[PDB]
Amino acid sequence: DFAKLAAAQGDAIDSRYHPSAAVRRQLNKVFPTHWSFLLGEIALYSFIILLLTGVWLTLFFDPSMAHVTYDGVYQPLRGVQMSRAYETALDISFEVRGGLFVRQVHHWAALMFAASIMVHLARIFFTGAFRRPREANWVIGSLLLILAMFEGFFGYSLPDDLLSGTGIRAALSGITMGIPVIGTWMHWALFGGDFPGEILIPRLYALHILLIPGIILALIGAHLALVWFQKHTQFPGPGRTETNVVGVRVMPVFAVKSGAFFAMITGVLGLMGGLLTINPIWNLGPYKPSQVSAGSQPDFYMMWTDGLIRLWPAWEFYPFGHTIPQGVWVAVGMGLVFALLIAYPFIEKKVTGDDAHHNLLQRPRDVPVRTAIGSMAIALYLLLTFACMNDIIALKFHISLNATTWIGRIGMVVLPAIVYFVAYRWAISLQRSDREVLEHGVETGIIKRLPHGAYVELHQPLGPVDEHGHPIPLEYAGAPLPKRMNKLGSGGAPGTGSFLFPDPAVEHEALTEAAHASEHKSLTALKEHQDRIHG
């Protein structure tokens, strides 16, 4: 009554619907097993956490700006005027059982979300997963990053703790007023009044439960549909031509490791949602516009923005009776970088000439100027971030505060040039380091030559050898070639027994002969498939 009822309900599902065609198409789909192809899954797998916590945070949070005295449990805030957003965020922190944990693992899931989006953008950038067939997928993923950034900024500003209330005052109301023609108009449309306009926090709650995460969920749905139906890309390797995806199928293997990786991402978020404090809004105060911190720094995925405020050197213009302030520039500048980050595949489609349907990836050493432009962007992000904690860097690492913001202000101009030089020539030297492992072998320990005194490194060749001390030099194929005989089948047979006690020797012989024959069968089947493609 456990397999018979499964067969009966399966024939019922096949009777009502006719799914088995469009289920077999799904659970025979192959995803490749490279590790970096899990990175964007983190941006999925934390995002579901952001719903599963976040829904829970919706049914306790009360947005308002109606000024209430606390009269609750938290003693250093009693009788103090606070917005009811902050009061019920304090109630999430201290009243409800396991409430501080759910809101902390929610904030940590937001950090892992907006950081894994950046890690995965680094993946699909430097591996070249964005040219011709997947450029719209880059565009909707880039827009998904923009919505992630703005929506998280609506997130930690949603209680008006004053560390983020001054973040609204800096970013969302100083830059918004600082836009030339229609700046004040979109400010007073966004707030409905002055800066503590009484319908800001509920408007952010409206945009932040549903209105931006509805668009984020729609773009993730269409995004994973573009990854799903239009097949996944892959690195080139042994049996990996342009028009096939090699790897594991969905049903026995990929579903198990994907669900287990969802569970381990949730484990990392839960461990660091418990063991590490985040946004301690009771240590912070209610937002009152006459008191600040010293840090006053945003969350890290937006620290490149007002760090760009912290580094742009006070250039204001004054036309005939008006004022362009500094905040126009970064309102241009954030509009600049996004217009380079959305529209990059069309930019280098124009520059390079990549008018070809690319499915195989390119290793990020194989494309040195694009990896170097990318490392310019990575190090420029790291500079604009690492000079946004300008304050606390100059605090702890004892530097003059003026000195470290000048270090940033020169660094955003000269350090992309330095990292472009180092990145371009480092990619070319990584190419040359695995283009001499083909013309020579793989390096090992030293033998001396017998009749005279020499020292050869005793290279182990990768392909066919000639009759003498040099092999037939292979051609490059976009693959990671192994540079250690370690990573080949050399000395990789320890005792199979236990960590403390050995198994009997016939069992060791059976296990190592069976595993050796299975690995031999793996490379034999992959090699004969590779010969079937060309032959």
Partner 1 sequence: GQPTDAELAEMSREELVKLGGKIDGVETIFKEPRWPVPGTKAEKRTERLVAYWLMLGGLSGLALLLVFLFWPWEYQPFGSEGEFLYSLATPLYGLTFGLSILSIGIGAVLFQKKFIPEEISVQDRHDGRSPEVHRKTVAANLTDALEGSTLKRRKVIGLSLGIGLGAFGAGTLVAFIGGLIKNPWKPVVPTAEGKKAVLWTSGWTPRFKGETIYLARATGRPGESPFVKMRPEDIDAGGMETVFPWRESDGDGTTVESEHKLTEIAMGVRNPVMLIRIKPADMHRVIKRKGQESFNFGELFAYTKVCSHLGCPSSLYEQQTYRILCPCHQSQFDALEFAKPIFGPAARALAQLPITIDEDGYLVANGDFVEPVGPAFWERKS
Partner 2 sequence: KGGALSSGKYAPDLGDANPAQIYTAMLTGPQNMPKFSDRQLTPDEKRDIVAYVRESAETPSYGGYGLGGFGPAPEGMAMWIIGMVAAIGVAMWIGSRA
Ligand X SMILES: CCCCCCCCCCCCCCCC(=O)O[C@H](COC(=O)CCCCCCC[C@@H](C)CCCCCCCCC)COP(=O)(O)O[C@H]1[C@H](O)[C@H](O)[C@H](O)[C@@H](O)[C@@H]1O
Binding residues for ligand X (CB under 6 A) = 59, 95-97, 180-182, 184-186, 189-190, 275, 319-320, 322
Cα–Cα distance, 278 to 52 (Å, whole number): 18
The one of ligand MQ9, partner 1, partner 2, none whose footprint includes residue 310, by CB under 5 to 8 A per kind, is: partner 1
Span of 122-130, 269-277, 431-439, 470-478 interacting with partner 1 by CB under 8 A: 269-277
Cα four-point dihedral sign 129, 135, 139, 144:
negative
HSE-up of residue 526 (Cα within 13 Å, Cβ side): 14
Q: Mark 451-490 with x for binding to partner 2 (rule: CB under 8 A) and - for no binding.
A: ----------------------------xx----------
Cα–Cα dist 326/452, whole Å: 74
**Separation CA 311–CA 408 (nearest Å):** 6
Q: Which does 367 bind (CB under 5 to 8 A by kind): partner 2, ligand X, ligand CDL, none?
A: none
Which of partner 1, ligand MQ9, ligand CDL, none does 18 bind, CB closer than 5 to 8 A by kind?
Answer: partner 1
Return the range that interacts with ligand CDL (CB under 6 A); candidates 127-135, 151-159, 247-255, 330-338.
330-338
SS3 per-residue string spanning 202-241: HHHHHHHHHHHHHHHHHHHHHHHHHHHCCCCCECCCCCCC
Q: Which of 242, 100, 215 is nearest to 159 (CA)?
A: 100
Tokens of 211: 């209105």
Out of 23, 139, 272, 369, point to the residue binding partner 2 (CB under 8 A).
272
Residue 233 annotated in ligand binding:
yes
Among the listed ranges 64-72, 382-390, 436-444, 460-468, the one in contact with partner 2 (CB under 8 A) is 382-390
Range in contact with ligand HEM (rule: CB under 6 A) among 11-19, 105-113, 265-273, 320-328: 105-113
Annotated binding residue 107: yes
Query: Per DSSP, what are the bridge partners of residue 317?
Result: 324
Which residues lie across from 465 on neighbouring strands? 471
Separation of alpha carbons 513 and 362, rounded Å? 36
* Spatial separation of the C-alpha atoms in residues 139 and 128, rounded to whole Å: 14
456 forms beta bridges with: 447
Which residue's CB is nearer to partner 1, number 254 or number 424?
254
Can you tell me the distance from the alpha carbon of 286 to that of 81, in angstroms, rounded to the nearest whole number?
A: 7
Instruction: Name the minimum Å distance from CB 359 to ligand MQ9.
Output: 21
Which x/- pattern over 146-165 shows residues binding partner 1 (rule: CB under 8 A)? --------------------
Of the candidates 166, 165, 164, 191, which has an alpha carbon nearest to the alpha carbon of residue 177? 191
Reported residue count of the chain is 535
Binding footprint of ligand MQ9 on the chain (CB under 6 A):
118-119, 121-122, 125, 171-172, 175-176, 179, 300, 304-305, 331-332, 334-337, 339-341, 343-344, 346-347, 350, 373-374, 377-378, 380-382, 385
Closer to ligand CDL at the Cβ: 413 or 515?
A: 413
Q: Are 71 and 113 in contact (CB under 8 A)?
A: no
Q: Rounded to whole angstroms, how far apart are CA atoms 282 and 86?
A: 9
296: left (phi over 0), alpha (psi -120 to 50) or beta: left
Residues that bind ligand CDL (CB under 6 A): 333, 336-337, 412-413, 416-418, 420-421
Binding-site residue numbers are 40, 103, 106-107, 120, 123, 134, 208, 223, 232-233, 279
Residues that bind ligand HEM (CB under 6 A): 37, 39-41, 43-44, 47, 50-51, 54-55, 57-58, 61, 89, 92, 103, 106-107, 110, 113-114, 117, 120-121, 124, 129-130, 134, 137-138, 141-142, 144-145, 148, 151-152, 155-156, 158-159, 208-209, 213, 216, 220, 223-224, 227, 232-233, 279
